Coordinates of C-alpha atoms in Angstrom, one line a residue:
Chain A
X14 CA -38.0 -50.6 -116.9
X15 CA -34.9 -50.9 -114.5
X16 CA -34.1 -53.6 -112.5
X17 CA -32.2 -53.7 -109.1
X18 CA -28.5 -54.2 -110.8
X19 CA -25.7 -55.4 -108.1
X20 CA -22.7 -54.4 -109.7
X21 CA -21.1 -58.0 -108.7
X22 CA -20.5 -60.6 -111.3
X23 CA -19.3 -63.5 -108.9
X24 CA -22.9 -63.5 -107.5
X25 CA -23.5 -65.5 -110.9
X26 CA -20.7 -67.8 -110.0
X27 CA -22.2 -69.5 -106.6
X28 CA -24.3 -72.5 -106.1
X29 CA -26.1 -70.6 -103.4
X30 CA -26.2 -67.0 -101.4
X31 CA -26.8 -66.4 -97.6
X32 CA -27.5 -63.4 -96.4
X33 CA -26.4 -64.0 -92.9
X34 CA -27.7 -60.6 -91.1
X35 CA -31.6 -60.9 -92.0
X36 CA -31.6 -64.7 -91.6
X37 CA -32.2 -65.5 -95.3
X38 CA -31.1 -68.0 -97.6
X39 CA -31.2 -68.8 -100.9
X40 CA -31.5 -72.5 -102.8
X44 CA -34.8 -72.2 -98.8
X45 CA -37.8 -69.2 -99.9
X46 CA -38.2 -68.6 -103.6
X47 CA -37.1 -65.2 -104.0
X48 CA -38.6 -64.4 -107.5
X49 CA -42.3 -65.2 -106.3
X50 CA -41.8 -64.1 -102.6
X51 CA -39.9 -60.5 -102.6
X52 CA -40.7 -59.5 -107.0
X53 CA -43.6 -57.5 -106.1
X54 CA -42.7 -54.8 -103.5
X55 CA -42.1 -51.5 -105.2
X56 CA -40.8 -49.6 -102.2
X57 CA -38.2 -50.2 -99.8
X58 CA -38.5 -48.0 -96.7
X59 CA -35.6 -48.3 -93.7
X60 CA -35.7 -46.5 -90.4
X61 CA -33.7 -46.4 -87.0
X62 CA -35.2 -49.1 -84.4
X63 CA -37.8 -51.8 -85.0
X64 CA -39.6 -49.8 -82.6
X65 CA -40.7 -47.9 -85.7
X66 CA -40.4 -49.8 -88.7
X67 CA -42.8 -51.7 -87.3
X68 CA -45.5 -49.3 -86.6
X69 CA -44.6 -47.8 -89.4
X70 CA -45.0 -51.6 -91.3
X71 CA -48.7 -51.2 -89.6
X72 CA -49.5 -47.8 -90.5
X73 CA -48.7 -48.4 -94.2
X74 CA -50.5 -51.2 -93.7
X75 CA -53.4 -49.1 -93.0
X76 CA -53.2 -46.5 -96.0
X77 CA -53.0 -49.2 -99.0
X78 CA -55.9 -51.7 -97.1
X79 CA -53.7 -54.7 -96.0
X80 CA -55.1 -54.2 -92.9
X81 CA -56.8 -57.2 -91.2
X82 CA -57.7 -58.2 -87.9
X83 CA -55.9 -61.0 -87.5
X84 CA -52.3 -61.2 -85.7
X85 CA -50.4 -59.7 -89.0
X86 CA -47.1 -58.6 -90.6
X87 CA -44.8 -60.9 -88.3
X88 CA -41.8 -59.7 -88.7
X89 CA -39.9 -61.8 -91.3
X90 CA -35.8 -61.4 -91.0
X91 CA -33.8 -62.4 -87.7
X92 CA -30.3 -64.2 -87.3
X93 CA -29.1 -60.9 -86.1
X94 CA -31.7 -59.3 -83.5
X95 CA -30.0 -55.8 -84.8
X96 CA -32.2 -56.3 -88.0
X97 CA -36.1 -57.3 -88.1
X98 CA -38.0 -56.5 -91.1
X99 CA -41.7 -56.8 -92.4
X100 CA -43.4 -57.5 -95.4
X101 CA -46.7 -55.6 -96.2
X102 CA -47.8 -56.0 -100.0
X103 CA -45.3 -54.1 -101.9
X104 CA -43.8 -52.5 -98.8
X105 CA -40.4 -53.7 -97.2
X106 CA -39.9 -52.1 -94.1
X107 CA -36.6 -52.7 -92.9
X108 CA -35.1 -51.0 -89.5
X109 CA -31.6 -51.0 -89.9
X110 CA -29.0 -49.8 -86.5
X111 CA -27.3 -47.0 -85.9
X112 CA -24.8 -45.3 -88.2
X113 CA -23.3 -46.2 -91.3
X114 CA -21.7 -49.7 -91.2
X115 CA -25.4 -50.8 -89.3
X116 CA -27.0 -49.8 -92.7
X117 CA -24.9 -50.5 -95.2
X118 CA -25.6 -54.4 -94.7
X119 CA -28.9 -54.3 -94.7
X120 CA -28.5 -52.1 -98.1
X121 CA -25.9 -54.8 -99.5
X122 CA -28.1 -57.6 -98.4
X123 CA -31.3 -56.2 -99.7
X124 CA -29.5 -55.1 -103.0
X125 CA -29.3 -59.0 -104.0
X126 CA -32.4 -59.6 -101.6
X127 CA -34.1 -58.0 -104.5
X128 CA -31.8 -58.8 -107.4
X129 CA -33.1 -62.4 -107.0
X130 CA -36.4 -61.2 -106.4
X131 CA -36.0 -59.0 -109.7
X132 CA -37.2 -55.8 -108.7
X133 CA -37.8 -53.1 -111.1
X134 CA -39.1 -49.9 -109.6
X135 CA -38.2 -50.2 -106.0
X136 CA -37.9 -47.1 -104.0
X137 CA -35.8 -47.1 -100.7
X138 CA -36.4 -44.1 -98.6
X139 CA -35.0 -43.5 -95.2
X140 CA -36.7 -42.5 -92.4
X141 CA -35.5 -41.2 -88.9
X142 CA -34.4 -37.9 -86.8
X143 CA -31.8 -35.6 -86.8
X144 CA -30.5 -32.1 -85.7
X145 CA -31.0 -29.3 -87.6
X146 CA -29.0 -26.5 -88.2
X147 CA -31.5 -23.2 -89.0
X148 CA -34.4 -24.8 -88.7
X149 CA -37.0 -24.7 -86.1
X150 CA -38.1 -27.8 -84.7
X151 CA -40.4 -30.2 -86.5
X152 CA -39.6 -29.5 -90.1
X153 CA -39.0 -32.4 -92.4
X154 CA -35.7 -31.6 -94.4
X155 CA -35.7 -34.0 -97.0
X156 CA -31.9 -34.6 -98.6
X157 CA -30.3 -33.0 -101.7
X158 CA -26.9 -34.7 -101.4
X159 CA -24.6 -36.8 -98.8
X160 CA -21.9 -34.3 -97.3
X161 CA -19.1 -35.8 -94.7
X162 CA -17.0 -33.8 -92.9
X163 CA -15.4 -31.5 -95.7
X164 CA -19.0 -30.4 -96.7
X165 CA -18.4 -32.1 -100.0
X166 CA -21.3 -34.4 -101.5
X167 CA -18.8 -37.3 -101.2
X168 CA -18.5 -40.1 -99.0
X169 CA -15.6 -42.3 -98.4
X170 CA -15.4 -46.3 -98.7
X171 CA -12.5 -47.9 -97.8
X172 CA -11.9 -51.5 -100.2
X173 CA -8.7 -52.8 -99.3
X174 CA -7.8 -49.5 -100.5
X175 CA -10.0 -46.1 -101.4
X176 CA -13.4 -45.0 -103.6
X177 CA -14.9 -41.9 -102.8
X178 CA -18.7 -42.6 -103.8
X179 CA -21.2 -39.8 -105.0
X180 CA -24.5 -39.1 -102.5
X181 CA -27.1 -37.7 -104.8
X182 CA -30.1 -38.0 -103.3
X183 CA -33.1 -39.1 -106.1
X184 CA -34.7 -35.7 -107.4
X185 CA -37.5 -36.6 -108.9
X186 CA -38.2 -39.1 -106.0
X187 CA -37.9 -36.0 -103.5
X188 CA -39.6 -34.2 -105.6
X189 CA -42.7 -36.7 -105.4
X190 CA -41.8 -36.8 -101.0
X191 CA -41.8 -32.5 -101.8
X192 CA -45.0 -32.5 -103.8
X193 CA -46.9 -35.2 -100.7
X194 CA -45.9 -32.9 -98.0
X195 CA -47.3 -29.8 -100.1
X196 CA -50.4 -32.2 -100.5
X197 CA -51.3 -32.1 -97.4
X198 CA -49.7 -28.9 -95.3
X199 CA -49.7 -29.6 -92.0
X200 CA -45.9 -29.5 -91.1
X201 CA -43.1 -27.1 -92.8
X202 CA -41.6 -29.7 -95.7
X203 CA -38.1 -28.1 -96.9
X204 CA -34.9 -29.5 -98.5
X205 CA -31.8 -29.8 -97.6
X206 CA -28.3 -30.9 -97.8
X207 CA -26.9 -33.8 -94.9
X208 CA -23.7 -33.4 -92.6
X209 CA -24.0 -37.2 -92.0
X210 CA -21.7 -38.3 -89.3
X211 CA -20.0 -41.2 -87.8
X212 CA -19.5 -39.5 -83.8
X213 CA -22.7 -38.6 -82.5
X214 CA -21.1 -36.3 -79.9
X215 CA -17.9 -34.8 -81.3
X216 CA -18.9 -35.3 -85.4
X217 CA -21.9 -33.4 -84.7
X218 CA -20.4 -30.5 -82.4
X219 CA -21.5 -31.2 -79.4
X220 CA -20.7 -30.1 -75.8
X221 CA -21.7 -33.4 -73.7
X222 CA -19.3 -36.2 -75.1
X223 CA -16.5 -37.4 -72.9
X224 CA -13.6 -36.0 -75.3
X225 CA -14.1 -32.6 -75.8
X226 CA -11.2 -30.5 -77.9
X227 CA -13.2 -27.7 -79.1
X228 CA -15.8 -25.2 -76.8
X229 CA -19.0 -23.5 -78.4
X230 CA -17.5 -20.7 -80.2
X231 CA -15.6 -23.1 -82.2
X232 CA -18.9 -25.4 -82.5
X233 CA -20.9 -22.8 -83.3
X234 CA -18.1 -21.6 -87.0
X235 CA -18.8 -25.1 -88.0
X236 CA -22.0 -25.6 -87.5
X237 CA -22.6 -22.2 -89.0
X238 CA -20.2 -23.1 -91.6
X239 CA -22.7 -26.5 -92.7
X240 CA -25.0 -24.1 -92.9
X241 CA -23.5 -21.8 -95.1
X242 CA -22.2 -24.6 -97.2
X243 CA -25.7 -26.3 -98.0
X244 CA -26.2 -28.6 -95.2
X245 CA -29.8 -28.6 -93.1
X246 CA -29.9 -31.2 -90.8
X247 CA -27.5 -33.2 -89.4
X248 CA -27.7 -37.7 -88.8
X249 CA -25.5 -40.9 -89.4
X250 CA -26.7 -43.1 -91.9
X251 CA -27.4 -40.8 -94.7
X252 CA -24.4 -40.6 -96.8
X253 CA -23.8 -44.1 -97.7
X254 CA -27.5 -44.3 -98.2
X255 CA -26.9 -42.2 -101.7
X256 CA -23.9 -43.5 -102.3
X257 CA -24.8 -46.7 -102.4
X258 CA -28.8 -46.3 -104.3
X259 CA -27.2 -44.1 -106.6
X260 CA -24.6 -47.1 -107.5
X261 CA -27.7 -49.7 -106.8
X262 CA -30.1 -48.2 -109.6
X263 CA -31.7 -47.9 -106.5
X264 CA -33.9 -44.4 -106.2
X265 CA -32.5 -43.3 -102.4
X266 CA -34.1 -40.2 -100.2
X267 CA -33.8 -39.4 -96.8
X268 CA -36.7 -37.9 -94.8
X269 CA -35.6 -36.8 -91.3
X270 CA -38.0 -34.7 -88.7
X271 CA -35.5 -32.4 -87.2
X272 CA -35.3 -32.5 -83.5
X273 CA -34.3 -28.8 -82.6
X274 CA -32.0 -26.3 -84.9
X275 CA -28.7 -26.7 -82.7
X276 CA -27.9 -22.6 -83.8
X277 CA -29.9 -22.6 -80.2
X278 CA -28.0 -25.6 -78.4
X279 CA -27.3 -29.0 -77.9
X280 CA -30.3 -30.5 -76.0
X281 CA -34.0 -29.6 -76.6
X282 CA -36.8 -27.5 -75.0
X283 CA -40.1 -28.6 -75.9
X284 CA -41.6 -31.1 -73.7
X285 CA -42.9 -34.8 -74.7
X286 CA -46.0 -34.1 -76.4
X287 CA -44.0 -31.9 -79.1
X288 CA -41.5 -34.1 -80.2
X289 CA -44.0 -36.8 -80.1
X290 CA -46.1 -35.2 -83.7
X291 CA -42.6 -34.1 -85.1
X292 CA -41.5 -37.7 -84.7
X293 CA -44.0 -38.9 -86.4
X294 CA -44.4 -37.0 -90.1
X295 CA -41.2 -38.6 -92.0
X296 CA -43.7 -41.3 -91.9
X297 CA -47.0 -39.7 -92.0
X298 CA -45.6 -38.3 -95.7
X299 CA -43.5 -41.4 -96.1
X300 CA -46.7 -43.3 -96.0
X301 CA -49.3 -41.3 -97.6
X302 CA -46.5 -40.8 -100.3
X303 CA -46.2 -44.2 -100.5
X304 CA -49.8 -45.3 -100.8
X305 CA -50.4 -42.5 -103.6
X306 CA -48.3 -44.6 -105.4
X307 CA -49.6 -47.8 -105.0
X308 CA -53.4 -45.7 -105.8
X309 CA -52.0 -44.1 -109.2
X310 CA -49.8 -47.2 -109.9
Chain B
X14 CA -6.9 -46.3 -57.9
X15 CA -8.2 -45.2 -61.0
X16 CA -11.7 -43.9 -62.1
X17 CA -13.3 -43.6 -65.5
X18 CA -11.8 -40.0 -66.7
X19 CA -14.4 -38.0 -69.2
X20 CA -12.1 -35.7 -71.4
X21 CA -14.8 -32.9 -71.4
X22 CA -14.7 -29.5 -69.5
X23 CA -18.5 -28.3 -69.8
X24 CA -19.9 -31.7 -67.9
X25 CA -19.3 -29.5 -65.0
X26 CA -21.0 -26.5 -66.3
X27 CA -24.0 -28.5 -66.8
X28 CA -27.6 -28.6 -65.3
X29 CA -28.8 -32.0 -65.5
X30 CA -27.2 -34.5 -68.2
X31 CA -29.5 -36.4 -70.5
X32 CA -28.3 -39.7 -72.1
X33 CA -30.3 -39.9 -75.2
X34 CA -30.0 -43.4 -75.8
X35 CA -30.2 -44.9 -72.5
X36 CA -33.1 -42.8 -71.4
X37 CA -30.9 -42.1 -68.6
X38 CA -31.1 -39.0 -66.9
X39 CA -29.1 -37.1 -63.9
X40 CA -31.4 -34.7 -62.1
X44 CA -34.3 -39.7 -61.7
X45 CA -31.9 -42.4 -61.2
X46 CA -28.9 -42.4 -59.0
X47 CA -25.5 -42.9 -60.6
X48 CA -23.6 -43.1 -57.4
X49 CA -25.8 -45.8 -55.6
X50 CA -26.9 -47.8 -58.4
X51 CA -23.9 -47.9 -60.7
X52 CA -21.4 -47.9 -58.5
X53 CA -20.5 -51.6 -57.7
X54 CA -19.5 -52.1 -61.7
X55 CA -15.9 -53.2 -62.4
X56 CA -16.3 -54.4 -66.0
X57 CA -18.2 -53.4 -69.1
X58 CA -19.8 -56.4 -71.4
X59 CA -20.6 -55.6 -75.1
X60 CA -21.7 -57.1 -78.4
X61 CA -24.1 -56.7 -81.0
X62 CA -27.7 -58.4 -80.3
X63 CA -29.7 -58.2 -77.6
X64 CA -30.3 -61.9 -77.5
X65 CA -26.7 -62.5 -77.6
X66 CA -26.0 -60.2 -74.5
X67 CA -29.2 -61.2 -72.5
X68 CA -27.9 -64.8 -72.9
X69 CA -24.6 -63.4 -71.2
X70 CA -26.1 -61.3 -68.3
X71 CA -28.9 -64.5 -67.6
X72 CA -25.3 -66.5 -67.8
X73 CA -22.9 -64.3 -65.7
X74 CA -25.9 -64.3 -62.7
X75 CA -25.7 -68.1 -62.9
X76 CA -22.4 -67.8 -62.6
X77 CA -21.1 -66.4 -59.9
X78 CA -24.0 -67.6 -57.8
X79 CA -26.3 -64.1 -57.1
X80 CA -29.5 -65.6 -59.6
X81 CA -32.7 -66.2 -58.7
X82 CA -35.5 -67.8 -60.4
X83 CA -38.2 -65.4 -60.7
X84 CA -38.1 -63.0 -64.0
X85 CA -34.8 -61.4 -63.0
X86 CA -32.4 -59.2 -65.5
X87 CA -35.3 -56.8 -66.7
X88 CA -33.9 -54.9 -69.4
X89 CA -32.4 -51.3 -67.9
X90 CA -32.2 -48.6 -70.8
X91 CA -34.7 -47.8 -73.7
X92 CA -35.5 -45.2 -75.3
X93 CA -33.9 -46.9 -78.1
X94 CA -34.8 -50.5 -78.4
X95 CA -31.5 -51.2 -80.7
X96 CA -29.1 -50.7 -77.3
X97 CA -29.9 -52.8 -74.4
X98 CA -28.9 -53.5 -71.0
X99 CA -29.0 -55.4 -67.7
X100 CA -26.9 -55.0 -64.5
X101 CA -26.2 -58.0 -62.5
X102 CA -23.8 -57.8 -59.8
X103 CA -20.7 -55.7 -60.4
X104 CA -21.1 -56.7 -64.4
X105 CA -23.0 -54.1 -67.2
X106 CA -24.1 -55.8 -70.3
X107 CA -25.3 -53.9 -73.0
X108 CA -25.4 -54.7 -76.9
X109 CA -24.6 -52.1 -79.0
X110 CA -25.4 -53.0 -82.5
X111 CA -23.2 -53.0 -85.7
X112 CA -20.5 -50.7 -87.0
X113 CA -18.5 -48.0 -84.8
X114 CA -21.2 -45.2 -85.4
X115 CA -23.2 -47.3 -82.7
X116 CA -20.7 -48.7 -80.5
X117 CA -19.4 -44.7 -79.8
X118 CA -22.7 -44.2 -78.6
X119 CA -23.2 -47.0 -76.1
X120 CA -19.6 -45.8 -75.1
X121 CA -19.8 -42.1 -74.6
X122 CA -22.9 -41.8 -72.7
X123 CA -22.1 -45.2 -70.9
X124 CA -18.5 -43.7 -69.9
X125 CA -20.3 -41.1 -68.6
X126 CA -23.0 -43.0 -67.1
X127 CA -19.5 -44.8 -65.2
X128 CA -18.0 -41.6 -64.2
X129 CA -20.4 -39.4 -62.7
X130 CA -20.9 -43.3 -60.5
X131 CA -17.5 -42.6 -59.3
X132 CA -16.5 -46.0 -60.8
X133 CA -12.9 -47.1 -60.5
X134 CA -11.8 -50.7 -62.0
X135 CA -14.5 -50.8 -64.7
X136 CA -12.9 -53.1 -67.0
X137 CA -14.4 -52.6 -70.9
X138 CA -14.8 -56.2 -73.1
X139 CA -16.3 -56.5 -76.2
X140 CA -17.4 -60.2 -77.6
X141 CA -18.1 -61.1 -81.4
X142 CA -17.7 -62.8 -84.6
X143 CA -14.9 -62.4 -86.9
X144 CA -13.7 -63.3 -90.0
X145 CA -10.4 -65.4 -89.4
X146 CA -7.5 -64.7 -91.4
X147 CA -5.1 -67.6 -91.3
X148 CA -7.0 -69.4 -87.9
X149 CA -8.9 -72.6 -87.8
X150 CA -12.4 -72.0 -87.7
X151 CA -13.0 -70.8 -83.9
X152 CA -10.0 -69.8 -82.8
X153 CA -10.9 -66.9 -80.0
X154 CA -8.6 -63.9 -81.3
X155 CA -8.5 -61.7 -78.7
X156 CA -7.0 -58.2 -80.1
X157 CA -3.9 -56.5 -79.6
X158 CA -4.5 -53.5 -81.8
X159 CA -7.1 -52.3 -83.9
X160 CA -5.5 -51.2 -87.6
X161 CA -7.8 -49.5 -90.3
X162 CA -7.0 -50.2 -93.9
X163 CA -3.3 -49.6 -94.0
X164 CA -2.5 -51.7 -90.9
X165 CA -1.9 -49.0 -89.2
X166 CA -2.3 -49.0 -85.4
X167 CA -4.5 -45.6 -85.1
X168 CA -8.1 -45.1 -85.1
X169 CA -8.8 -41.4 -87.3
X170 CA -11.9 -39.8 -85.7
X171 CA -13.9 -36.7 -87.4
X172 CA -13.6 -33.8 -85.0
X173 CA -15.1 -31.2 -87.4
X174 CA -11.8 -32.2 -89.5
X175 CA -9.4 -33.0 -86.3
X176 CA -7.9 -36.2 -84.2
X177 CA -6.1 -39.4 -84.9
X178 CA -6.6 -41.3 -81.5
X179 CA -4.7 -44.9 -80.7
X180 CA -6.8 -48.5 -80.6
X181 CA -4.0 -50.7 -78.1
X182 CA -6.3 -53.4 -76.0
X183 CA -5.1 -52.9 -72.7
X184 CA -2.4 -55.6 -72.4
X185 CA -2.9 -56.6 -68.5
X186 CA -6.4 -57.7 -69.1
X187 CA -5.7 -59.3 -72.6
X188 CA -2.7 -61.9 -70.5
X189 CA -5.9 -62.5 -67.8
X190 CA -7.9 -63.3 -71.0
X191 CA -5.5 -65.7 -72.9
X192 CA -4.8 -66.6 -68.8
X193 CA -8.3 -67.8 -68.7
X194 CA -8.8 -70.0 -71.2
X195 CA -5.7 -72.4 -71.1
X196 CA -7.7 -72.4 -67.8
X197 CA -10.6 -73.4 -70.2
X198 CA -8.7 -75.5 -72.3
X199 CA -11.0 -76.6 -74.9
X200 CA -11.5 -74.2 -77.4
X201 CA -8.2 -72.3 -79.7
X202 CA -6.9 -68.8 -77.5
X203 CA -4.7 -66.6 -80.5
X204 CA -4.1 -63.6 -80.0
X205 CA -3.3 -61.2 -83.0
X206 CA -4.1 -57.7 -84.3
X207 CA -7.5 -57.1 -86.2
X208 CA -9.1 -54.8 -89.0
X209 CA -12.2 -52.7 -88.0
X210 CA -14.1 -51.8 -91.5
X211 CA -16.3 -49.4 -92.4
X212 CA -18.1 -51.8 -94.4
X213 CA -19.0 -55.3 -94.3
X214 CA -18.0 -56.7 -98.3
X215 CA -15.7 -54.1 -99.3
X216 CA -14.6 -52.5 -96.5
X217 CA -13.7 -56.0 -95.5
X218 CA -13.4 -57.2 -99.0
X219 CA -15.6 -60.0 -99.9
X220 CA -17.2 -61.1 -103.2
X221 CA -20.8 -61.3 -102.7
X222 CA -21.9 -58.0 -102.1
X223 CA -23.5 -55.2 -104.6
X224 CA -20.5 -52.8 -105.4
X225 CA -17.5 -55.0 -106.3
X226 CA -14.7 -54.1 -108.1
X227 CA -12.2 -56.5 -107.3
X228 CA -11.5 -60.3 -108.3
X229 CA -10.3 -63.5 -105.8
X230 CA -6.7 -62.8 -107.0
X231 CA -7.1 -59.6 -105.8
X232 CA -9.2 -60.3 -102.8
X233 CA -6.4 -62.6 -101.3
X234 CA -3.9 -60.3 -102.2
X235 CA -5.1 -57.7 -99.6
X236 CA -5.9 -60.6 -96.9
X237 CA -2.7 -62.2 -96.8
X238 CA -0.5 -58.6 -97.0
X239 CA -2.9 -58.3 -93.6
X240 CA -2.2 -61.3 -92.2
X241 CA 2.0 -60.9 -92.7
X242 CA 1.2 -57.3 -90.7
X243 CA -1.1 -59.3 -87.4
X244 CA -4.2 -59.2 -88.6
X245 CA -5.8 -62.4 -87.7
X246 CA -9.5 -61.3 -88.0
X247 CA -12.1 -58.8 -89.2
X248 CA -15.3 -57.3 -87.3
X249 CA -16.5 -53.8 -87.6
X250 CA -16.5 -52.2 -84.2
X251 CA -13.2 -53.1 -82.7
X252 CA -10.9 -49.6 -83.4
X253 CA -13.5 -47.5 -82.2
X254 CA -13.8 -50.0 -79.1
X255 CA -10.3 -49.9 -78.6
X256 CA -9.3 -46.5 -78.7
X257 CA -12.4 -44.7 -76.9
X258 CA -11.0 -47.0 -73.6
X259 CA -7.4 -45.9 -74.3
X260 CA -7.8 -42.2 -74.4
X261 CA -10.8 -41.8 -70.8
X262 CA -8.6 -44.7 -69.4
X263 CA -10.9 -47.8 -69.8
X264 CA -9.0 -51.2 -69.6
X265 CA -9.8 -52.5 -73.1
X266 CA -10.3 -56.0 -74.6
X267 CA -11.7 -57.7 -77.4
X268 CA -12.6 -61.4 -77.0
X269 CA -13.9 -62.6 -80.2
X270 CA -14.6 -65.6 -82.1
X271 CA -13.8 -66.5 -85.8
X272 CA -16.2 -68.2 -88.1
X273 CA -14.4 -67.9 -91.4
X274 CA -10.7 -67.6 -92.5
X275 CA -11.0 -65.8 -95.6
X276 CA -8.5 -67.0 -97.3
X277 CA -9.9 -69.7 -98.6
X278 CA -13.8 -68.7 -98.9
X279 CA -16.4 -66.1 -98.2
X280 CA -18.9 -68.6 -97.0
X281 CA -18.7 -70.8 -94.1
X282 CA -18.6 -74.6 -94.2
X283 CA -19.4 -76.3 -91.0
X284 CA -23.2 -77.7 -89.6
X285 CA -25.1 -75.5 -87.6
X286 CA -24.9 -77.1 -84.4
X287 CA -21.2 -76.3 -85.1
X288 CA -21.7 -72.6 -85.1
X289 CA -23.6 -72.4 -81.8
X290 CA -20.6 -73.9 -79.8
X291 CA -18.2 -71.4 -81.8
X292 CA -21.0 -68.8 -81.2
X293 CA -20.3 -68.9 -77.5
X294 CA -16.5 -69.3 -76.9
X295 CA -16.7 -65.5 -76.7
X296 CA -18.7 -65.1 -73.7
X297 CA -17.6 -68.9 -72.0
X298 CA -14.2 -67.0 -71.7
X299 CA -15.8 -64.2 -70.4
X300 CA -17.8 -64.9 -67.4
X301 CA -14.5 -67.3 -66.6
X302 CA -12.3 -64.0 -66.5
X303 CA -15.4 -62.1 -65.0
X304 CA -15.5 -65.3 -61.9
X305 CA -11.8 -65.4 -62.0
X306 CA -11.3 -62.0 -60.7
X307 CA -14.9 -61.5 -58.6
X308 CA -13.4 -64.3 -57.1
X309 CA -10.2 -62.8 -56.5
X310 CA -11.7 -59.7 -55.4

């Protein structure tokens, strides 16, 4: 119906494209054949998830073997290692914007050669949450930055503030597989996603601190008040970029604490140890309720 | 003479100190003791590209030993990794500045409470080379963002535009090193830290694209007449988080490329490799040439 476009025309004009960060290549595996069939991208913080997670969805469509499977398929850069289970591409992906913007621009023609045409990429991680009690799973409306506008900035040579819609309908079907199951409070909302895990976000445990908790708290409060529900790195550029990829993007992010309480969290391992694991519970029984009805 | 300085006042008021990244914690492992001996900082972005460092720095100064030494020393997130052999710390820190600012803050920390004084900071990469020969080791002066302008802008709920100088003293003992080394190229120049890895940078193979070659090169070479003599993603963040809490900084990186006249590499692969290491080769000399003069 749509097909992965990559606004890039000199892309045509090359012999031959290397994506250097994954470790792939093009005219050495046959991308039409090898990548045309997987209808959902799905990215996440560290290989030490995206790789269970590349087992668990494994598990919910029937891939599952008992052989030694799903060896993980991109290198060159240890940073990013990949999987392929049948139409699944679980891709981990670093820390922070410029970490996942590659692996977005080098799966955007990753797939343009491949051809896909109904891909969803959904990302998958933590975050903080402002007004929200631990372990609830606010999914993304839009991408704000630091001016709680749904805009992020991309410098080229020059400018380009980018859009950061998140996909409705596409949250809408992460919303209505979370309300099929009800086992874990599934709300939406907006994304302070930052670049300064310690001063970006607030916080009172950096090592340059210009600004106390009275002054952390009017911001904070004030992302609340201004639509934004949980708080992470990677998120803005992810809607900038899908929404300018015919790409359907969403963000599903277990909050970690609601930091209108703090900065560091209470509940001991066993709690955060569920929570962590329902952006992919829902991404996954989300996902395989599409490859059942597809 | 002069210890790692954490710009933060509620460190102090503080219970026990969590690094989320490291795993580390203040009330298990003891900073003092342990961390102590460290007078320089190693960084880069894999882990297989900083374990080949700290398995090569051990073999270097002559403290390895040949049962399964340099055991990794912080998870909790597999991205970042560590090891600690002698008076070095390697640890990777991924891609972008998002990550690097995380290894940073809670490593700078990590270095202070240890009562640390001499910790020397160096970073080690790949580069785009504006106007060098393929390999040409630039090792920074000052880290510009898009204007060419030596300042690093950091979100601080909307507040401050800190510095990115390398720390000249270390950056003479770094060019001093490898005229000691004398067979691989030793400029020295001011670099680019981007955002983002085509545009950002500027390159035409990437998924967003709205610029030709003639206006690709335009932008390169109105970089180069400013000092720019290479591109990597990391560096302003790097520079300027030493600057302000003190740290002696210095970037020792490699260039593949030189963008003016491609956005593909030409040369075999055995002739990468060799490239691939004049980062750390002039390391671990500059690392021996002062343990040695210590």
């Amino acid at each position: 119906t749509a097909q992965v476009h990559v606004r890039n025309s000199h892309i045509l004009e090359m012999h031959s494209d290397v994506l250097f960060h994954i470790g792939l290549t093009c005219s050495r595996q046959q991308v039409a054949n090898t990548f045309g069939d997987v209808k959902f991208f799905i990215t996440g913080g560290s290989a030490e998830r995206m790789t269970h997670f590349a087992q668990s969805v494994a598990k919910e469509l029937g891939i599952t073997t008992p052989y030694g499977y799903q060896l993980a398929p991109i290198g060159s850069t240890s940073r990013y290692t990949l999987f392929k289970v049948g139409p699944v591409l679980v891709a981990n992906h670093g820390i922070g914007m410029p970490s996942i913007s590659i692996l977005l621009h080098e799966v955007t023609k990753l797939l343009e050669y491949a051809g896909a045409h109904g891909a969803t990429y959904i990302r998958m991680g933590t975050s903080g949450g402002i007004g929200v009690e631990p372990g609830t799973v606010v999914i993304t409306s839009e991408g704000v930055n630091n001016k709680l506008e749904s805009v992020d900035e991309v410098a080229v040579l020059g400018s380009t503030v980018r859009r950061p819609s998140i996909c409705s309908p596409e949250v809408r079907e992460e919303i209505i597989t979370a309300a099929k199951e009800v086992g874990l409070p599934y709300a939406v909302g907006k994304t302070l996603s930052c670049n300064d895990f310690y001063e970006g976000q607030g916080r009172l445990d950096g090592a340059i601190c210009e600004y106390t908790l009275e002054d952390k708290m009017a911001f904070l409060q004030k992302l609340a008040d201004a639509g934004v529900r949980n708080i992470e790195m990677e998120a803005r550029l992810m809607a900038g970029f899908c929404h300018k990829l015919n790409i359907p993007v969403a963000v599903v992010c277990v909050t970690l604490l609601n930091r209108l309480n703090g900065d560091q969290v209470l509940s001991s391992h066993e709690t955060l140890q569920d929570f962590e694991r329902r952006p992919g519970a829902v991404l996954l029984h989300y996902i395989k309720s599409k490859v059942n009805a597809s």
